[PDB]
Structure 1
Amino acid sequence: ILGGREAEAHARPYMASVQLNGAHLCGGVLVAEQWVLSAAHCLEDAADGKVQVLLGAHSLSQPEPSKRLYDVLRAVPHPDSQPDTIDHDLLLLQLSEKATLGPAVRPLPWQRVDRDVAPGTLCDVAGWGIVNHAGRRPDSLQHVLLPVLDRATCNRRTHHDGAITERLMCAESNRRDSCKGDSGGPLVCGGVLEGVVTSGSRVCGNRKKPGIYTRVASYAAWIDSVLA
């Protein structure tokens, strides 16, 4: 997260770190007792690798009573996802067992009504992704508030130009933005999950290249089907 601030410890009980061979890779969001939602491209790079999900965490490295590492029973990438498209970029991880719920570990309700978040709405994005332009990695969860940027605008030419479908939403990236390593994590507006940070490569913190977030309401049948 660029241009943000350290998050209040455990104030986002839904926040997950998706890890590969013991290291943070991508964010993710606890959406049911046994299921974490993240981005598919994060795990394109993976089959030779143990995937785990850290819940209840603020620090990546220090112990905390609430902090618990869960093995993964199943990774389920969206069926229409492909390398080199930003579209359908979601992944569901089934935890090995139901997460132990408490004040620090709780699922986030997510948007099921397929209507865009109004332009200018301030939404919150959190992650353990890079915090500057050098590539520095924080130990502790960071977060930033970003205004949603209308789709009509996001499709303009010196922007993202053509790609942004009805299943994607955009937010401003003017010095405050999500970046590499924040992919898969939550964009939350009025306390509901609205988007998941996309995992394509892109520059961070440049006003001319807005953040892209996959709209979870667009995918509500698929998410229901997987959990069922």
Structure 2
Amino acid sequence: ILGGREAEAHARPYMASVQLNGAHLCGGVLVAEQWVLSAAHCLEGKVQVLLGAHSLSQPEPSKRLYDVLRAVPHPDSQPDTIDHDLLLLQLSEKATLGPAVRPLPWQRVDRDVAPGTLCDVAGWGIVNHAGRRPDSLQHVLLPVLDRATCNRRTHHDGAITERLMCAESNRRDSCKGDSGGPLVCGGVLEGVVTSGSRVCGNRKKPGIYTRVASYAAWIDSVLASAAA
């Protein structure tokens, strides 16, 4: 997260660190007891999910590391597009829920968030252009950018479909290692960070977030199959 501030420890109990070979790779969102939503591109080694965390390194009573039983990318995702960039991770077991570990309700009403609304995006991604990595979770409030603006040639040139939303990227933004994490509006998950342009913090290249409401059937069906 660029231009943000330290999160309150454990105040966003859905926040997950998706880890590869023991190192923070991408954010994720706990969406049910045994499932974390993240971004497919992140998994383009040993994948694990750290729940209950604030600091990546320091001892905390709620911190618990989970192995991943199955990684389920969206079936229409592809390495060369930004579309359908969602990933469902099934934990080795049901997470131990508590004040610090709780799923986040996600939006099922398929309607755009009003442009200009500030939504909250959190992560352990880089915090400056030098690539410095934070030990503790950061977050930032970003304004939703209207799709008609975001699709202009100078910005994302038509790539913002109805299943995507944009937020302003003027200095404040999501960045490397934030993909997969949440864009939360009014307390409900609206977006999942995707990497868009690799450029962060440049107003000319807004942040892109996958709209969860567009993917309700997929999430419901993956979870229902596993529950059979």
Question: Separation in 1 of the partners of 2:36 and 2:174?
Answer: 19
Aligned 8 A contact 1:187 1:213 in 2? yes
* Contiguous gaps of at least 5 residues in structure 1: none
**What is the TM-score with the length of structure 2 in the denominator?**
0.97
The Cα offsets for residues 126-176 of structure 1, whole Å up to 9 and x where unpaired, read as 000000010000000000000000101100111111110000000000010
Aligned 8 A contact 2:195 2:208 in 1? no
Question: Separation in 2 of the partners of 1:38 and 1:83?
Answer: 15
SS in 1 for 2:218: helix
Question: Separation in 2 of the partners of 1:221 and 1:85?
Answer: 21
Structure 2 counterparts to residues 19-168 of structure 1, below 5 A: 19-44=19-44, 49-168=45-164
The Cα offsets for residues 47-83 of structure 1, whole Å up to 9 and x where unpaired, read as xx11000000000011100000000010000000001
Aligned 8 A contact 2:124 2:137 in 1? yes
Cα deviation, residue 199, structure 1: 3.3
* Contiguous gaps of at least 5 residues in structure 2: none
Could you list the structure 1 runs, at least 4 aligned residues long, displaced by more than 6 angstroms after superposition: none
The Cα offsets for residues 186-219 of structure 1, whole Å up to 9 and x where unpaired, read as 0000000000001345201001100000000000
Cα deviation, residue 84, structure 1: 1.3
The Cα offsets for residues 6-51 of structure 1, whole Å up to 9 and x where unpaired, read as 000000000000000110000000000000000000001xxxx110
Question: Separation in 2 of the partners of 1:40 and 1:192?
Answer: 21
Aligned 8 A contact 1:180 1:201 in 2? no
Aligned 8 A contact 1:186 1:193 in 2? yes
Q: Provide closer, same or farther for how the CA distance between residues 73 and 192 of structure 1 changes in structure 2, counting only shifts above 3 A.
A: same
Question: Separation in 1 of the partners of 2:218 and 2:67?
Answer: 23
Question: Separation in 2 of the partners of 1:67 and 1:103?
Answer: 12
Aligned 8 A contact 2:29 2:181 in 1? yes
The Cα offsets for residues 89-129 of structure 1, whole Å up to 9 and x where unpaired, read as 00000000000011100000000011100101110000000
Aligned 8 A contact 2:175 2:195 in 1? no
Matched length: 224
Indicate the larger mover: 193-202 or 161-170: 193-202
Question: Separation in 2 of the partners of 1:110 and 1:189?
Answer: 10
SS in 1 for 2:162: coil
Question: Separation in 2 of the partners of 1:201 and 1:60?
Answer: 27
Q: Provide closer, same or farther for how the CA distance between residues 63 and 201 of structure 1 changes in structure 2, counting only shifts above 3 A.
A: farther
Question: Separation in 2 of the partners of 1:105 and 1:159?
Answer: 37
**What is the TM-score with the length of structure 1 in the denominator?**
0.97
Question: Separation in 2 of the partners of 1:212 and 1:132?
Answer: 19
Question: Separation in 2 of the partners of 1:148 and 1:200?
Answer: 15
SS in 1 for 2:217: helix
Q: What value does the CA root-mean-square deviation take over the aligned residues? A: 0.8
